[PDB]
């Protein structure tokens, strides 16, 4: 079913304080390895004027290094697939809510993606395209009211060293009745290992592992 080496294709509609945008995408994963690298191609809204970093959390915990001894809430949902629900709080109150439903066909995931925000101050780090990388996290995953959620805070590096806060909370949703983990944490970290100019053209890579 999940086999070592899964390829991954997703589409992101959204919009950004207004300016409209889509963005596909084809990739790589390793399930087992905890691993992913996409290659993400802006079709609408190019150049995007808003940073491109508070997008890359939303492109799957499927790959995800899961221990024997904790159930994988995300390998158990397929073939059927599962969906996510994530709020990004960030501390200068601009908010995004983005959605993903995720299944599979074969050797290939499938990601539809949403994905809005607003509030972002016009001179503040997003807007004015200041951000350089997620720093690492770590995801808390609790069971609750029979489905996954989970929190984490995230900080943006930002130009002149300061860090730009954010809150994410995520609830997770399989298609079918899997076996509940207990409360673990999810180690992870998001890099754009290349990229053009205007974020035309990203490569971005993801390694994340359960404890």
């Known amino acids: 079913v999940i086999k070592p080496e899964m390829k991954i294709k997703l589409r992101m509609e959204g919009a950004v304080n207004g300016h409209k945008f889509v963005i596909e995408g084809e990739g790589i994963g390793k399930p087992y390895e905890g691993t992913q690298t996409l290659d993400l191609t802006v079709e609408e809204g190019a150049p995007l004027p808003f940073s491109y970093d508070i997008l890359t959390p939303a492109f799957n915990r499927a790959f995800t290094k899961y221990p024997e001894d904790i159930p994988d809430y995300f390998k158990q949902a397929f073939p059927e697939g599962y969906s ?124 994340a592992e359960a404890r």
């Open 84 to 207: 996510w629900e994530r709020s990004m709080t960030y501390e200068d109150q601009g908010i995004c809510i983005a959605t993903s439903d995720i299944t599979m066909e074969g050797d290939c995931f499938f990601y539809e993606i949403r994905f809005d925000g607003t509030n972002f101050p016009p001179n503040g780090p997003v807007m004015q395209k200041k951000t350089l990388k997620w720093e690492p996290s770590t995801d808390k995953m609790y069971v609750e009211d029979g489905v996954l959620k989970g929190d984490v805070e995230m900080a943006l590096l930002l130009e002149g060293g300061g860090h730009y806060r954010c809150d994410f909370k995520t609830t997770y949703k399989a298609k079918k009745d899997v076996r509940l983990p207990d409360a673990h944490e999810v180690d992870y970290r998001i890099e754009i290992l290349s990229h053009d100019k205007d974020y035309n053209k990203v490569r971005l890579y993801e390694h």
